[PDB]
Design a protein around this ligand. Structure first.
Ligand code: CL
Ligand code: CL
Ligand code: CL
Lengths: 65, 65, 65, 65, 65, 65
């Protein structure tokens, strides 16, 4: 209920995000696509990130949902 | 059954919380919204935290249900 | 089958416990309430602990179940 | 299908085991009881270990089913 | 819905990938096969990688679906 | 679909494997038995390894599936 409109807004508005993984590694890019299981994160390559390995998504700017 | 009224009380009363992640990283803010999968944690930005990556939520002050 | 009567006895008899998290962090207090997903652990604050982040619960004294 | 008779043999024969957690911490004792979620591990006290946090169970001696 | 065509494209085109595990370890090779649980990663040997332990798949070069 | 024939071949042909856990610990031995949840790994003792704690299984030699 909450994460779909949130991720959709980040994708639609091309919001740069930081994605922190469960081990603390920080990824950066824009959300190109997502579903209930993964996020496709675009930077220099399109890397697929599994949501089970994500702790938090931090937008680079305030976002109006 | 327990976490829903607990998190709702924290949300309604805007209690500042610390959220500790499974890797030990400490996040801080107010609970803006939540569901069975994620918590929207508001600080300088509205960051989404996946509950599977949360170990403990610690309110900054005693609260009651 | 096993964890419900065990946690219920710890709660009913106000047994001080140590709760070790999957990252090795040690929490301490008394079990105020619990369900199939979380434990409410009371010390100086009532902190909610997600069972998916718990490795072991260690009672401070032998307990008769 | 495999872990149930394996753990039951360890329990019935009171074989001392080492239980390694997903963070690498080593626990030790005898399996007092178990189900599909937890192991009750008996040493100085009866500590409950969540199976989701277990990586490996190592008996102190060869055992057979 | 996203990871299946993504991984299939990586498999069909024999794109070298880096697979980062939830502990940060980097694996490398080509995706020989995959399903909803595991990836068979081919290098000197065919190692099976459990998707629950994967954080991110990073292709060595831009790819398109 | 993939991991059953793969693990069955490793078991049938007594292939020495290394099993890496989600914390990076390396186990070694031969797969004596397995099911959808655990692997029984034989070395000097028969230790049970939970698949939820496994990141990758690496055969010591190329294997024909
Ligand atoms: Cl933007
Ligand atoms: Cl007591
Ligand atoms: Cl062999």
């Amino acid at each position: 209920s909450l994460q779909d409109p949130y991720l959709n807004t980040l994708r639609k508005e091309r919001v740069p995000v930081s994605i922190y993984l469960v081990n603390g590694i920080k990824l950066q890019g824009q959300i190109e696509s997502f579903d209930q299981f993964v996020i496709l994160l675009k930077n220099t390559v399109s890397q697929m990130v599994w949501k089970h390995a994500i702790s938090t998504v931090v937008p680079s700017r305030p976002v109006r949902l």
